[PDB]
Amino acid sequence: SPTLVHTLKVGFYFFLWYFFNFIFNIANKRTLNMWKYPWVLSTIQLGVGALYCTFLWVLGLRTKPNVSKKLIKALIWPSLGHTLGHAATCMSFSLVAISFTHVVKSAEPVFGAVGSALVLGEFFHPLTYLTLVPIVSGVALSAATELTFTWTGFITAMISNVAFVTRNITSKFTMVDFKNEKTLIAQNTYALITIISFFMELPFALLMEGFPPLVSAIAGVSKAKLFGSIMFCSLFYHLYNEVSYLCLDNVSPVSFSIGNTIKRVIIIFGSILVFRTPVTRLNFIGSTIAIIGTMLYSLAKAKLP
Amino acid sequence: SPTLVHTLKVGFYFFLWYFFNFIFNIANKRTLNMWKYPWVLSTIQLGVGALYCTFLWVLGLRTKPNVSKKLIKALIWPSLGHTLGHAATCMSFSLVAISFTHVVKSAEPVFGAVGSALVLGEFFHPLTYLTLVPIVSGVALSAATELTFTWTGFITAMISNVAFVTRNITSKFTMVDFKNEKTLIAQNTYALITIISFFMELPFALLMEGFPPLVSAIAGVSKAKLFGSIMFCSLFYHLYNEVSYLCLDNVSPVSFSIGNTIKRVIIIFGSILVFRTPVTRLNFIGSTIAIIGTMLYSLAKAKLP
Numbered sequence: 380s381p382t383l384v385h386t387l388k389v390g391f392y393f394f395l396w397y398f399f400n401f402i403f404n405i406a407n408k409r410t411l412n413m414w415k416y417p418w419v420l421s422t423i424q425l426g427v428g429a430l431y432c433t434f435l436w437v438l439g440l441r442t443k444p445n446v447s448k449k450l451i452k453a454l455i456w457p458s459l460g461h462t463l464g465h466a467a468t469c470m471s472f473s474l475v476a477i478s479f480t481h482v483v484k485s486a487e488p489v490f491g492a493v494g495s496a497l498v499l500g501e502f503f504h505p506l507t508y509l510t511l512v513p514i515v516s517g518v519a520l521s522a523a524t525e526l527t528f529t530w531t532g533f534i535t536a537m538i539s540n541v542a543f544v545t546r547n548i549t550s551k552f553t554m555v556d557f558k559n560e561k562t563l564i565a566q567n568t569y570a571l572i573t574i575i576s577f578f579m580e581l582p583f584a585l586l587m588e589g590f591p592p593l594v595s596a597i598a599g600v601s602k603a604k605l606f607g608s609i610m611f612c613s614l615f616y617h618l619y620n621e622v623s624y625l626c627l628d629n630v631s632p633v634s635f636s637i638g639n640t641i642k643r644v645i646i647i648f649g650s651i652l653v654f655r656t657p658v659t660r661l662n663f664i665g666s667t668i669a670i671i672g673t674m675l676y677s678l679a680k681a682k683l684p
Numbered sequence: 685s686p687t688l689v690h691t692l693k694v695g696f697y698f699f700l701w702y703f704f705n706f707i708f709n710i711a712n713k714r715t716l717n718m719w720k721y722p723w724v725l726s727t728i729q730l731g732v733g734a735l736y737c738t739f740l741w742v743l744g745l746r747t748k749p750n751v752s753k754k755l756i757k758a759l760i761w762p763s764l765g766h767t768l769g770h771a772a773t774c775m776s777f778s779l780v781a782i783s784f785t786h787v788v789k790s791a792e793p794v795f796g797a798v799g800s801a802l803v804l805g806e807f808f809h810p811l812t813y814l815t816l817v818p819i820v821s822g823v824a825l826s827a828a829t830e831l832t833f834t835w836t837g838f839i840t841a842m843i844s845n846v847a848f849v850t851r852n853i854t855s856k857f858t859m860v861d862f863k864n865e866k867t868l869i870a871q872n873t874y875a876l877i878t879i880i881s882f883f884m885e886l887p888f889a890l891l892m893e894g895f896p897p898l899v900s901a902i903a904g905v906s907k908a909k910l911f912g913s914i915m916f917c918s919l920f921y922h923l924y925n926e927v928s929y930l931c932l933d934n935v936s937p938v939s940f941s942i943g944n945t946i947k948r949v950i951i952i953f954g955s956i957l958v959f960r961t962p963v964t965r966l967n968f969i970g971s972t973i974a975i976i977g978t979m980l981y982s983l984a985k986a987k988l989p
């Protein structure tokens with residue numbers, strides 16, 4: 380029983396990850412529909428999470444990490460990947476329906492398997508190349524039938540696959556290299572990342588968009604409602620990423636990306652219902668084939684030498 | 685000297701392959717512009733090749749092969765791959781500019797490497813996945829900017845990659861399994877394939893297109909001139925495929941496809957010149973990136989563990 384029970388506590392971390400991420404995605408897109416500034420918004424979300432974590436340390440509510448220069452340097456690459464994937468994903472969110480963004484990001488386990496095998500010196504069974512046929516065909520079919528498609532919205536989402544895979548693999552190194560450091564719990568690893576990531580993105584956000592006026596492009600929405608939406612999606616942005624690093628602490632980077640693809644099916648279904656996103660038969664079939672292909676690719680990689 | 689003598693003779697085979705294939709491609713496209721019946725035209729080209737080979741046998745100009753039940757069974761899958769690839773490629777030739785068809789078929793070495801490794805139990809280095817990025821990006825950019833793009837023209841060309849790789853691999857097995865049958869020279873192997881392939885395609889061709897009237901869609905072409913153009917491209921269709929099996933007999937199936945990609949650079953350059961094909965800046969950048977990626981892919985697979 381304790382073995383299956385331990386998987387229930389870990390599975391609950393995955394549920395929180397999915398539950399917080401769905402609240403984030405809906406509120407984040409509603410913010411972008413009123414306030415189309417992805418650079419500044421994504422930077423705000425990192426800063427709110429940075430401030431939230433420092434408050435927990437100040438109040439003694441969370442163990443303070445024994446920060447060393449060795450750890451900081453070992454967190455640069457996780458932070459560069461997080462910042463780049465975050466800014467690219469928010470840019471995609473601002474340009475297309477978020478359901479299409481998560482379809483593109485559903486190919487993350489393929490990038491994760493390649494990057495992980497490059498590091499671990501592994502090799503791929505030829506059958507994994509066959510499973511790329513439904514993935515490439517599915518994504519191409521989904522993009523060809525997506526009403527909101529733009530080339531920039533598609534490419535920025537594809538970029539985030541590379542950046543987040545880089546984040547997850549390098550973060551996994553740090554978490555294992557500092558396994559005996561009891562103060563570097565999973566939440567503190569992401570806490571330091573979101574603090575570094577904030578200052579990494581901050582100059583780009585100001586150069587790209589400046590200080591956008593706090594005005595809703597949707598007529599009739601007060602500034603207080605716009606500010607509450609910005610703060611609401613920023614709070615749940617941090618919570619879902621924080622809980623996800625608990626999940627990353629308990630699984631491999633590739634398994635983490637598989638858990639992400641399951642998350643995207645939930646977000647895709649939920650977002651098209653909430654937003655009444657128009658979806659044609661070919662578009663549903665294309666997206667479904669691509670995600671089935673990603674699972675088959677993962678199954679082929681896992682079950683073959 | 686003996687090994688260099690052989691590689692020089694093999695090199696002359698590749699030259700005849702490229703030279704005959706260029707003559708074919710120009711004449712075949714000029715025929716399709718006048719007489720847009722890809723099923724029947726591709727069937728005629730197989731039959732004219734079948735008749736050419738039987739004349740050599742009847743006149744004593746070429747050793748007759750000892751045809752056995754085992755050999756015919758070993759040539760069914762080579763003929764299936766040849767018929768499907770030939771019919772799919774000709775369909776693509778009739779729908780888009782042949783320069784675009786050969787850009788899509790330039791990815792053949794990737795399919796060939798997967799097919800070989802799948803049969804031989806080989807494994808892929810992770811860096812071969814990175815080389816897919818310029819291949820997929822280049823082909824996508826090329827297709828997004830090709831003025832004559834149609835989905836059917838693109839997909840039929842992609843299908844021929846799978847069919848011809850199947851043909852090359854299964855043919856190489858039969859040629860190796862029958863290496864001690866002295867009557868089965870490389871030209872007799874393809875001679876038997878074009879005979880089987882002709883009768884495989886014939887009922888489908890009549891099913892799809894019936895008996896097309898020998899009338900040119902371009903004014904000023906007599907029926908005799910159209911008939912001459914059909915016979916001309918049919919002769920060089922058989923000649924280039926016949927000499928290519930001399931190349932296949934002396935190289936691996938992967939090296940054969942790499943030779944095919946070199947061939948298509950020549951075909952693409954010559955065809956855009958002869959037909960004055962419109963090519964934008966973004967279009968030949970994408971096509972070049974795609975072919976560079978395929979060559980980088982082949983370099984990675986060959987030079988890596």
Ligand SMILES: CCCCCCCC/C=C\CCCCCCCC(=O)OC[C@H](O)CO
Nearest residue numbers: 508511512515516517519520523524835842
């Ligand atoms: C080994 C690496 C992978 C190699 C194998 C890659 C296979 C990709 C081939 C074709 C994708 C095209 C998918 C089918 C696209 C159909 C598009 C379509 O139906 O368009 C409808 C129209 O646009 C409605 O508006």
Ligand SMILES: CCCCCCCC/C=C\CCCCCCCC(=O)OC[C@H](O)CO
Nearest residue numbers: 486489511514515518519522523528820824
């Ligand atoms: C293994 C990792 C898998 C990830 C890689 C997936 C393969 C990428 C597929 C196609 C690239 C190009 C997208 C094709 C989209 C063509 C349709 C299109 O863009 O037309 C829209 C038009 O511009 C307005 O509606």
Ligand SMILES: CCCCCCCC/C=C\CCCCCCCC(=O)OC[C@H](O)CO
Nearest residue numbers: 478479482641644647658663666667670671
């Ligand atoms: C909720 C249960 C999650 C369990 C997960 C286990 C793995 C599921 C694998 C394949 C089914 C997923 C295919 C459905 C993908 C959504 C297709 C879709 O709705 O596309 C909308 C379109 O993309 C709008 O832009």
Ligand SMILES: CCCCCCCC/C=C\CCCCCCCC(=O)OC[C@H](O)CO
Nearest residue numbers: 489490493530813816817820821824825828
């Ligand atoms: C592990 C790696 C597995 C394989 C991963 C493959 C990822 C390639 C995905 C997308 C490239 C698409 C590039 C599309 C180039 C942009 C097209 C464009 O710029 O628009 C064209 C033109 O402007 C319209 O009129």
Ligand SMILES: CCCCCCCC/C=C\CCCCCCCC(=O)OC[C@H](O)CO
Nearest residue numbers: 519523791794795819820823824827828833
């Ligand atoms: C080994 C791997 C090599 C094969 C990898 C190939 C990847 C190509 C991806 C998608 C194909 C379609 C993408 C291009 C589609 C854009 C063109 C388009 O759809 O335009 C619609 C309109 O009908 C015309 O103008």
